[PDB]
């Protein structure tokens, strides 16, 4: 029918949003520490699956935290040090979160392209008569 | 725009007193010799505004 | 002769923003002649006398310049962008009204 | 008037005197 | 919401200017001493923290004061000087501030170049609009 | 309410210029002995206002010397001396000019996107 | 009437992302002025009223500074970016329906 | 409150003051 | 007139090029010593002018400044006078290296203006 | 005669020689 094109590329752009959104937080949070309840922030990853209802778009699952050894840094001069001295940093490695972004920007714009080819077509199948 | 005019006349001008230095230094030697003194004027130019 | 005038009105709209550009576009040419006065004309007031030959204005100075240069560049190339874009303005309406008269005989 | 105004007569010739007589 | 992400953004680039700003205010007190009502200069820091909206941006509560100890140089000449005489020099890590400057303007740098990113893919996201 | 965009824009880039030109006035006289008259040169420097006729864009007052002592020292063997042998120098302050210069210029490059921006925004008003 | 209401709500958010556009350049425009507070709108309630002059209120200091001005350059981009952006969406989606509207007329 | 926001009244100016009085 | 435009900045671009193309050629001539008939460079420079109410910017002429020669003592040279002080170019340096840059900016000025007068132009070839 | 103008008559050769005959 042509129109579940439309279905699947809102499926791939909305996935798409959400890694990029992912990839920020982490990009944004790569130096921060000690988050509330003082628990230390983890990267975090999305996992992508298809919307089988044979073929069809890509949803995301859930998020899960990677499970990368975790930083820590040697300062026994503030409160959060273990008993070591050692105040954990977050595992999230720059080059990687800067590859993610671009990936999925180029996605979303492959994406939206596709969803403006297949409007032009639909609207020549209506204009057919 | 005219800003870089001010300016690269102070440098010519901070040239042309070092030319006068480097003249005063080079005849250390010559009896009866009187040095030059220098220095710089401000030259205020007076439009219609500001 | 009802046409003429209706579409006469935005027609010298468009001829002013012409004529303004182009002192514009010559006080941007001579920005280094020495000796050179900046001009310009008062839109308003030189649409409602052509509606109703063109006498132009010396820009206020803002800043002293030795070389007896008065065009400014910010405030001009302000100008420029801002001419520019309400000839295309005065440009899309008349073809808006054009289009409009054009598609009734149809 | 306000700098970027439009005025009737032209501006003023502009001198740099290097010592006032 | 797609957009949450200048958000994101902003939220970091205002803590890493916050903590840009409290470390050149720390190399400026370097070598200060005795400020307002005789009390003795001590070093700042801040902490940052992630605003659970799950993932979200950072901010910075408030700034602390650095507990280690001042540096205690003895001159029986300053009317501070106390029955031991010695003075209460700052707490200055001038190499920690370094990089704490480098790794703040790093943070900013890699931020903007994600808001030029998004910025670009929220332009071209409006074509399909029409 | 689209076109005063232009004005508040236009007025900004001039302040800073004007800022900028005061700034390269006062690095250039940073040790001028005297001026024409005979008096000795005093640091200037400019006083914005709000352009309001409710905000608006920025707009330079006036231009006002320095209330800052200028500097003196002693020279008996020149003719602008006192009686005590003292000739006044300007009260010019080298890095605060070169940090006006650099906030102007980021400023400037701030004001050139915006109207950049806002100019791509009403180019494509027009097509509505 | 009927074509006016089917308008009236886009047409407005525009009208208010156009004046909270101007606030922002008039507040990142007075950046270096001593004195100035930072101005911006409330978005969300402006539109709500009017649909239902201007009223402005002052924003939350960001760091003290000893001049007095408080406005924050980085936050000020980011809300001129996030207005320009919607401002674009609203007349992306005006557009739209009045390319409907008068396509309904074929 | 937390800085960014919207408020209603203007903070208090900014001062400092090299000595205390 | 919206045609005028072309030929003036047509003038403008020539201007610019002139004055760029004098300052290219004192700095090369900083410290040429002699011409080809014994006489010693001299720094030139352009007339500008409007073409005329007010229109393009024309180069007038060519003239050599009239400033006294930077003139050196070299006793055992053909060249020399009776005194031995043989002339030398009275160019300075910041002068060229300030004038090529305005020339240029005022170059790419005109090639910016000439750009979005050509656009507009090709846009209203389009009315309705 | 004036500069980019147009004119039927060739302009002649341009030479540089390095020192007067």
């Given at each position: 029918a042509l129109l579940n094109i439309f279905d699947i590329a809102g499926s791939a752009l909305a996935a798409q949003s959400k890694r990029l959104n992912v990839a920020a937080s982490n990009l944004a949070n790569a130096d921060s520490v000690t988050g509330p309840d003082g628990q230390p922030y983890r990267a975090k990853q999305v996992v992508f699956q298809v919307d089988a209802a044979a073929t069809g778009g890509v949803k995301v699952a859930s998020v899960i935290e990677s499970q990368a050894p975790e930083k820590l840094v040697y300062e026994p001069g503030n409160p959060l040090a273990d008993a070591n001295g050692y105040v954990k940093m977050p595992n999230v490695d720059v080059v990687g979160e800067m590859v993610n972004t671009m990936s999925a920007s180029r996605s979303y714009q492959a994406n939206i392209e596709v969803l403006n080819t297949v409007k032009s077509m639909m609207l020549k199948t209506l204009t057919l008569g | 725009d005219h800003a870089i005019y001010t300016a690269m006349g102070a440098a010519s001008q901070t040239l042309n007193q070092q030319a006068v230095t480097a003249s005063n230094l080079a005849n250390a030697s010559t009896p009866g010799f009187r040095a030059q003194l220098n220095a710089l004027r401000a030259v205020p130019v007076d439009g219609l505004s500001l | 002769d009802r046409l003429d005038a209706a579409l006469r009105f935005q027609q010298e709209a468009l001829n002013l923003r012409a004529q303004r550009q182009e002192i514009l576009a010559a006080n941007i040419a001579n920005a280094d002649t020495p000796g050179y006065q900046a001009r310009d004309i008062d839109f308003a007031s030189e649409l409602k006398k052509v509606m109703v030959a063109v006498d132009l204005l010396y820009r206020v100075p803002d800043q002293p310049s030795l070389d007896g240069?008065?065009?400014?560049?910010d405030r001009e190339r302000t100008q420029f962008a801002d001419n520019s874009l309400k000839y295309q303005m005065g440009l899309t309406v008349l073809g808006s009204q054009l289009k409009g008269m054009m598609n009734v005989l149809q | 008037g306000v700098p970027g105004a439009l005025s009737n007569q032209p501006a003023p010739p502009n001198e740099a005197p290097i010592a006032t007589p």
């Amino acid at each position: 029918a042509l129109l579940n094109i439309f279905d699947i590329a809102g499926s791939a752009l909305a996935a798409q949003s959400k890694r990029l959104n992912v990839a920020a937080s982490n990009l944004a949070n790569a130096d921060s520490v000690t988050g509330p309840d003082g628990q230390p922030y983890r990267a975090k990853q999305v996992v992508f699956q298809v919307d089988a209802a044979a073929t069809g778009g890509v949803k995301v699952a859930s998020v899960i935290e990677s499970q990368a050894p975790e930083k820590l840094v040697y300062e026994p001069g503030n409160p959060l040090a273990d008993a070591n001295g050692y105040v954990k940093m977050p595992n999230v490695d720059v080059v990687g979160e800067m590859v993610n972004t671009m990936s999925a920007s180029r996605s979303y714009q492959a994406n939206i392209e596709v969803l403006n080819t297949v409007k032009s077509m639909m609207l020549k199948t209506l204009t057919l008569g | 725009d005219h800003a870089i005019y001010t300016a690269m006349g102070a440098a010519s001008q901070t040239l042309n007193q070092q030319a006068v230095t480097a003249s005063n230094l080079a005849n250390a030697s010559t009896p009866g010799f009187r040095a030059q003194l220098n220095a710089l004027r401000a030259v205020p130019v007076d439009g219609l505004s500001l | 002769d009802r046409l003429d005038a209706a579409l006469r009105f935005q027609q010298e709209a468009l001829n002013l923003r012409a004529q303004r550009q182009e002192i514009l576009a010559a006080n941007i040419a001579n920005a280094d002649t020495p000796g050179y006065q900046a001009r310009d004309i008062d839109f308003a007031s030189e649409l409602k006398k052509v509606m109703v030959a063109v006498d132009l204005l010396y820009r206020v100075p803002d800043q002293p310049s030795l070389d007896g240069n008065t065009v400014d560049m910010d405030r001009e190339r302000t100008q420029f962008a801002d001419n520019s874009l309400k000839y295309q303005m005065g440009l899309t309406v008349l073809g808006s009204q054009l289009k409009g008269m054009m598609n009734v005989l149809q | 008037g306000v700098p970027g105004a439009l005025s009737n007569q032209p501006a003023p010739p502009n001198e740099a005197p290097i010592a006032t007589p």
